[PDB]
Design a protein around this ligand. Sequence first.
Ligand code: SF4
Ligand code: SF4
Lengths: 326, 700, 329, 325
Amino acid sequence: ISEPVVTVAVEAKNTKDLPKLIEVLRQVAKEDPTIKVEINEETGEHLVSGMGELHLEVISYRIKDKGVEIQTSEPIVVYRETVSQLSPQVEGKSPNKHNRFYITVEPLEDELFKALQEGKLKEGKVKGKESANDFMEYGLDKEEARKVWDVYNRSVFINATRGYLDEVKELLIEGFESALNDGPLAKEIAMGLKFKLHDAKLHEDAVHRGPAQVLPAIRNAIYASMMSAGPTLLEPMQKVFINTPQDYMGPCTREIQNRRGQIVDMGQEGDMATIESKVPVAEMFGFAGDIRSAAEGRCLWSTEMSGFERLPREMQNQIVKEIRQR
Amino acid sequence: RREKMIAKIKDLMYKPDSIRNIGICAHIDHGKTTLSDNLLAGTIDAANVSMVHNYKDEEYLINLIDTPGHVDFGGDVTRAMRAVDGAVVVVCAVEGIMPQTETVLRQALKENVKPVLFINKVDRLINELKLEPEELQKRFINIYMEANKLIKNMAPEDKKEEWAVDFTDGSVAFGSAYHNWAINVPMMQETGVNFKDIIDYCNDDKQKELAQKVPLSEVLLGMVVEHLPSPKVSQEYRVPNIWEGDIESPAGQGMITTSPDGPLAVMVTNVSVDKHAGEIATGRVYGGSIEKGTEVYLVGSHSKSRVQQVGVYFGPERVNTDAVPAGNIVYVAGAKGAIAGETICSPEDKIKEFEGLDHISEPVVTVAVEAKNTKDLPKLIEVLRQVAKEDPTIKVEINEETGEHLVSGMGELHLEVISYRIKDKGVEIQTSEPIVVYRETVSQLSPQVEGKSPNKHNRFYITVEPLEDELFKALQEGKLKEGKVKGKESANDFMEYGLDKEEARKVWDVYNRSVFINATRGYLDEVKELLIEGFESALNDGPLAKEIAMGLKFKLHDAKLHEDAVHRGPAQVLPAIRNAIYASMMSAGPTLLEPMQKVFINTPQDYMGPCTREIQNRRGQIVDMGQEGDMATIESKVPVAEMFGFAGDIRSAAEGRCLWSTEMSGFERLPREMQNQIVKEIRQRKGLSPEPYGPEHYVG
Amino acid sequence: MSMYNMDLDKVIRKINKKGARTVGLQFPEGLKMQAVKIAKAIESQTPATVIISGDPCFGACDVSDYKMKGSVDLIVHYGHTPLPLKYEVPTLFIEAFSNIDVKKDLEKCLEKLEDYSKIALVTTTQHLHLLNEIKDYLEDNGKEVVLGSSKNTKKGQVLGCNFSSIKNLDAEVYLFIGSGNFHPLGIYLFTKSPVLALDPYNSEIRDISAFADRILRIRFARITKAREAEKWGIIVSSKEGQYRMKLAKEIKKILEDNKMEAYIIMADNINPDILLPYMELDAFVVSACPRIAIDDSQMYKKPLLTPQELEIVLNKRQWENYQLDEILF
Amino acid sequence: NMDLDKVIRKINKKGARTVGLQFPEGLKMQAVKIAKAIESQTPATVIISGDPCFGACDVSDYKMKGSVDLIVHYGHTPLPLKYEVPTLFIEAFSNIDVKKDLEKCLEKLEDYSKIALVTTTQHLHLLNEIKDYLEDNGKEVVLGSSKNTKKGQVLGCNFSSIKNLDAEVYLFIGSGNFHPLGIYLFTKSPVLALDPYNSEIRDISAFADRILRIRFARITKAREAEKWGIIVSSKEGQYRMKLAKEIKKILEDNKMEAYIIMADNINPDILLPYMELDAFVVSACPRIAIDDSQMYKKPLLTPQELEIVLNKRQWENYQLDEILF
Ligand code: SF4
Ligand code: SF4
């Protein structure tokens, strides 16, 4: 699907049309494969995540097809989180202070990340040993790669405990998934992380170690290790193609730059111009209005995915504040 | 026997002219100890030793007062000199005048001490170098020229000739303190010894024969009576340079004239908890008369006590006495807990202070000590509580979470001395390398912020602002008791020291220079106490580095509780308020504060540039710049974090002519550009998460 | 310090009269504050030794009769009117009635009720004694007020798991006199009616409907998630009043009938930490006090559901008939 | 390993309609697999005790009474406790490869000739193997036993079996460093532990230093206390009411206030409301005070530590707490 960049909250005006609001939401997500949906058990909102303002607008429209009288919120720029340096090893202590487990976290290799994003490498717990060929195929050094324990939510959790690690495997995988769901930056989905188990020890037996001991130890170690790697919040970016009469060249270029846009390529065919730009999805809300006035309606424009790129450094503090406050 | 001598001392102590208040100024290996011991002969290391001495058909009472000379504990140096009117300057004849000799002589001259010079270890010139008598003469003259250079530079201008040392009239002598002999030119023209005899006696090892008719104690104490001033003589000129009072005042005039009739005015010289005895303050009476069973008002304590036992000295022993008049050296017991440097006076007449502070002693460096064997432990605790009784600047905690005995004091060196003093008491210990004490605060007013409980249905709203300076300072300087606000119309006191009235009524608890204040009108009477506990717990370890917070107003604005009034307990309330507090502090521009020292240097003025440069290299701010004779005074502020090693570096920079002191200035705010690094160092060191959990970990 | 009348007087005279020599004290968390004060007074006035129950105590369903069996002669249990359930030990109930005066808030009550002629009054235990004066005021100002009783609850009293006393009253409005959202919340969810709540501490009168709808929409989302669950826990409590093993076993077989796995787990206090071990289980149905599943659901990642909510999951109960579960003896 | 076939044997014989399962929190996640197997193979319904469970002291026979006809309890050797509900104890011997950790253990034991062995329920099966191994490599091996404890076996509050061995060194086999700590404290001999789970071998005198010092500090703070709490447990194997009442009288004789608090599980949270109480004495499990001291603000003391507080034992003579019958 058009990798999701905007997420909007939609809820039923009558809390009794709820049984069929579920039907409406799953019909809309069936009709449009670019729209992905989930009901927040944490919040009580039904979220619709799509490919931009217009992508979501089509889905908010197709609530008419389902007849659900609803409120639809303004879309939020759905962010992902990553790290910009390697961390030193950080120790997580178990619930009693009974175990110390040490992990180092670093940005995952580009070849591996690409392979995950483009579907060459399937996700999930690395169980079968001889299936380690897959990790090698996706660019990992083989002997090092076979120590992968999970491939989880766009990252890899890997075991260098010799002998050590013998306790925690299942709990560590669950904790890996939970850690990737809500990252260190502002509880946004984590992407492109490698997590290496550096060292480990345990105080109480392995028959007094359960879930309340393993879960906090891994969870606290993981967040702390990510936060000490220069955690970066990223905005989704678009390649933006604008085809406009030459007459509106100056206004159209102005409109692109105003939306954090940078010119990529610029082609001319007779009296028409095609302009290729890159701009954050976050900065292009209401773009139909701005681009229309700035080109006197001459430009027709559309967008393709350019990744979940890093949100700019000087803007990061405010965006983190807004997300956390929400 | 003793009885006769003690009668004579009590006769003596009522004549100021027949006392000599004196000290010994020497480099550390030049034989102060052996001279002091042997002088007493006609060991020590005491408050004071007294000597009664006959000189020219008249009896005299000589107080040898302790005079430390450790040049990087300059407070102690200067205080000692303030007690004495005369000094025996002692120079090793082989090594000559040393850095340290110049330094301590200079402070003596500065505080209006008349010097008299003794050349020690004559034996080893004549053993090592075998001089001709003319070569002896010329080495004595050279040392006494160096001595006279310091007197001409430093002494009072009135006195630069009279106080200069002369070989001719016997204010200079020579000998060996060890082999118990001394001579000046007047003794040579009484016994008929020449320089050739001295050289023969020294070469032929006949030093016992010499000792016999030119005894160290007879010669040198005679020289002290002749040449060093009486309290009565001295106090006419010493009083204004030792004391910064109104000099026309009746306490001032009473000190000038050495009046036992004046208002009592004394200075405490040392206080030592003594091994069979109790706690004693040794002091000098400048004016008036201290009496046993008398009420006396320590001006440093801003307090009183009532003197039990007064007395004077009889050698290193103390003779209990009904009254001690001015000009004497005093022992008192029942001094409250008065410290070295304390100003004691009459209560009702209540004199001005000799030596005070501009900021009460907050300890700024902490060190860990443990007992090396896990068995001297219960005794290590007796040692540490003795140490903390004898020194009130040293504060001691025992970490329940860690098992360490933490010792916090006034600087690297102060703590070095303490971990030394532990070994004199005999716990075999290991001492850690020291840390700096930080404090946490906030710099801005915060937004209103919501703190939610685990169950997410309890939820308080609080803001934090810096506490008003009036209230902060009044807590610091003891005008306001800290603790839970009980008596309600005691809110008056908060008003007086700068808080609004409506603010004041609703102050609830006070703690760590801070106040938790109640903006909900109208309720809370079960949860109040839990809120206080949560508040105090939160401020003990602040958000940034788990360091003591201070300087805070907390306003509780609003709060919602989902459960019953009677189903709500601390598992709801304490995380909710404690989450609120960290979040609120983090949204108020949280600040690390560092401790700072006022740093005092006295050094000859050729070393102005080097010493000022050395201070500036350690992030130091020059405060004031004084000049007395050959030397320069530097006042600075320097961060405690940049003061490690300073005694080594400023020794090199001023060729050991530095005399320096520190005093606490309070905690400045750490600089902004510094803070991130230093906080990361403290969290690294404590095994915390490397970055400190911001508002996101307290929001939802 | 005393916001509530603990009737030290009565406890001591009955202890002494009965000749009990060891006495257990049970407090809800709101009154554990006073345990030591109370304990010191009893030990000063009798030669009896006091045993303070340190364990949590949510309600009258949660007496420590089993636990203190053999250990003390008498339990003094505070804060509740009893459930009529079987006592292994001599048990004294002290309700600990609030020392609060609602008279000063009745004017604003009247203004907020301009729109209602027929009122149900409701309180919880510590304000039961004030119903009279509220009711008299209201009827002297043209209201018709009804007190509901039932087999389980006193006249005008609710608890989170028994609203039996407002079942058949069919009023325009229910006016709750008390401290927290929970009891007003429960009355709203059972009645789906106008519910007003006077906090006689806040002096604040609040309509609860907004917060209620917020809760309900989260319950919807939990049930939505539970529809995918294939392996289930049925949670049962050893709490005297909360034991509903019959229902637990019935639900077991019903889930199995629906081609799913179901396992009964029994414990005393239910919290997320005790359920972390059962990694296989996708959702949980609470046979203990229903209020855990409703009130604390935000503490649990995995869905915690009442039996009634399970009925909605299995399409055996209508969404329009979402309801709180109850405890009856 | 769960001994499921034997559990099944016992279930079917005794005609169970309803079976309870008890685990330490370390074994709970195998409850589903076992419940599923038993429900597949028998007509019985399985009730998982979801209760936190420390040991054999912590049987939920009152909780499960009437609900289950049999209790299957894993990971523990039974105590001398008089079980109401019919109960089957399954030791659940370790899923382990102990093998090329043997030579590493020999390496670290070079300095010592006469060795005492100690281990726990879960490793009883390995004793003979390791005893005979050390013997065929020149060592003299002694295994303690006592009234309650099998040959070479100990518990956290039952160290009786290794009190009287006169070995020069003690080798503990397993994880949990309370056990080696107890061994060290009682014997005052060098003590090694093999943790066969992650292959760690170590001297426990090291780890004792810094714990003893912490206990000392605790004690020292407690010397200031004027009001005390005395914690007893409703758990059948932790119940020491006699003792608690003796301690109360003792503290009252020392002109202090004290109050008995009874609870099932002890944690920091449940002491939080007794704000007037300045310290606490644990008249339940000796491990609580020792293992979890960092979790409690206020000093938590064993009865031995209180003795120290009152100067009716010297710090000289520090001793762990033990639970007799
Ligand atoms: S909700 Fe019901 S069962 Fe639970 S504590 Fe309240 S009265 Fe007891
Ligand atoms: S040490 Fe404590 S938990 Fe272990 S068996 Fe003994 S009483 Fe039970």
